[PDB]
């Protein structure tokens, strides 16, 4: 059982896999190993978790700064916002699924 990371995340190499999607993040923190908060939503509306988030129980396994991470998620069709974090450093992007 781990605690969620309290630092800030980054959006590096932007991306599909004929259904699922992949995104790489960079954690600027030393509290590792913590749970990486990742989800999809429709934002400014109590970010209700939509989608599936395929990657199993993502955790920053090391206490070293600027670790890289591959995360694959199941975003819904249409426009969406891949949220990576929890708190005030929660980053958000935009997605569109094959319409």
């Amino acid at each position, epitope marked *: 059982s*781990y*605690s*969620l990371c*309290t630092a800030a995340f980054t959006f590096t190499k932007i991306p599909t896999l004929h259904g699922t999607v992949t995104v790489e993040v960079q954690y600027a*923190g030393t509290d590792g190993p913590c749970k990486v908060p990742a989800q999809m939503a429709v934002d400014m509306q109590t970010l209700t978790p939509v989608g599936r988030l395929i990657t199993a129980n993502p955790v920053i396994t090391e206490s070293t700064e600027n670790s890289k991470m591959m995360l694959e998620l199941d975003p819904p069709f249409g426009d969406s916002y891949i949220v990576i974090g929890v*708190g*005030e450093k929660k980053i958000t992007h935009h997605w569109h699924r094959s319409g």
Partner: antibody
Amino acid sequence: EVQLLESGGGLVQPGGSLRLSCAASGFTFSSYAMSWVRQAPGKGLEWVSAISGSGGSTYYADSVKGRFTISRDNSKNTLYLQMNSLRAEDTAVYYCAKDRGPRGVGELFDYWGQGTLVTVSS
Amino acid sequence: DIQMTQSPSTLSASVGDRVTITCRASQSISSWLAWYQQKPGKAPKLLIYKASSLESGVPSRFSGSGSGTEFTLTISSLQPDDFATYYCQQYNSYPWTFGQGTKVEIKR
């Protein structure tokens, strides 16, 4: 109407234990993260511990780690802080503050209670 | 532990004057920085988050600025109820550390 009310403090011998409570009332507790911040009399604010809205995540300060335990009872809208190995330097007014944003980690302390005093001495 | 140190430790000024408090970090924390006010015997109050964003209810004379390492809190025109001790806090990472404070006093 965010009202917070700390309870459960007072005088305890060094090495003893005491547990604080905090009855939150004016917001959806099952959605916001709460923290414990203390203030030694005559000094500044030191951060003690913070817990998540679900309780799955719980953070502590090094001077406190392995001796205190933060807990939550989302059914009764109260928040606790179990202090089991109190020393003299833990003498402070302990505050119960709530995250400025729901489903967070305790980055900011939006509302504060007035506190409860713990004096650890022989 | 990110070290917040404020400056100065004690301020004296008269009503109407502009006062500026300072807070330097041990490392770069972009804009993750709050400010609180504490009146003697009362609990602290959140005044400004993310460096320059005022919290609802805080007057317009309070303003915030700064990024990375050096942030300042400014009161455009000191008023008789603005005298308190002011703390600094970075929430860039855990454990959320504070500064030592800055006591604003009224000249007369």
